[PDB]
Symmetry: C2
Subunit: 248 residues, 2 copies
Amino acid sequence: NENLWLEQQLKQKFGLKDVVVVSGEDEETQLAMMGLHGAQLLDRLLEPGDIVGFSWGRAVSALVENLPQAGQSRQLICVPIIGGPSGKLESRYHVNTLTYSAAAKLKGESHLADFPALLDNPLIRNGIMQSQHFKTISAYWDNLDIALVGIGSPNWHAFYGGEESDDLNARQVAGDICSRFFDIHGAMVETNMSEKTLSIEMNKLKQARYSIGIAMSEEKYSGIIGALRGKYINCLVTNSSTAELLLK
Amino acid sequence: ENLWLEQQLKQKFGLKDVVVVSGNDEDEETQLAMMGLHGAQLLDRLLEPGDIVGFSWGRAVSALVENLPQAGQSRQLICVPIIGGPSGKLESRYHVNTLTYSAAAKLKGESHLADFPALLDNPLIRNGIMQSQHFKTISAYWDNLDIALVGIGSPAFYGGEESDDLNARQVAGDICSRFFDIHGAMVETNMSEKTLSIEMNKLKQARYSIGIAMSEEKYSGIIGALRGKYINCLVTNSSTAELLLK
């Protein structure tokens, strides 16, 4: 109803392909509802043979958990677009867990990543990038059709810790997607991590037919709006509260 | 079901526990599922509160995991991989992380997944990963493991050249991609310097190290595994138990 109008207004303001806006209430409830309607969006946007990429986290999890069980294959390929969280997320939100579950729901194939998302030593990080396994995953990223992505925003402390979060907070980092940081205007911004990361590059993400961000909250507003302005996503699954914030 | 065969294996090889299922002329996949089902009952019987439970990869361990009884109560169990990922060399279904996560759900425990590969291109990278906090955390569980579930490899996955080198080095089988001869002695290969998985010494310290395996070969990887004492329990079939004694 009003949600539909909020969806239309967002499409027009940010040049988006698709938008889902849910009402909600509680926090984790709203996320389940976003996950449900966002999963409905994904299922309609998918095309046979699509390479589908998944980031990690609660938000993407909500969508994957709500995916209808397909009765037939659309020759889909499911791949993670970031390495594993190295213990910093519980297994249920691990990028491989989500990728695997989505492949089962979608009756597709999955190719799981056996490298970490973050490596402290640049040397090791670089060496893994040269292995056949990484190149194989990366080559899927090169041809990504659809991405599902949460939007990070100042876990910010969890992932990056005080020391690195500082540089972020001082560098006016508004948010991140797959551990790729940007300002409120959408501009990329280098960090103590922009060298030690194993995840899809924003340039590649933008080449996807659909990059679907799923996120909510006035707290995450800067992250979400920055992603919109940078065009790192071209679809948005969110709630009415945030929607209105975005239209302000 | 097959109590004499089980006791014969226990006595010959010094095993704590053994399951021998009767494969009634039935095909391989079916026989494996049977092993999985009765092996799962054994694992569930052997668990103690707070056990750290280590899983290798592969479809034999998968058969067992797929057939774990769904626990109603937590036994504060912690499930972990005892080998890195296969780097796309196995279907996702049989990935060690997939198996670990699924085991934890059935056991109402917690899982800690491994975000490093089992086999690296070179020793530099594999040593660097070992210095990482994540690897240290996982390897700490290996150091105090209570129960392990492993398949046993025998003579594609390692490449024709490596395969040939294995054949030339008299390698009869592997556990967690650590290789041994037919008498169960360890053999070091061009891959040991590139491998990230539990050491056999750490596997031997576990209360139960459960091999699940079958073979059509008189001279199998399993007899090696037993002689080397890398496992102290075995889940297998009638035909293999008989071979192991014959």
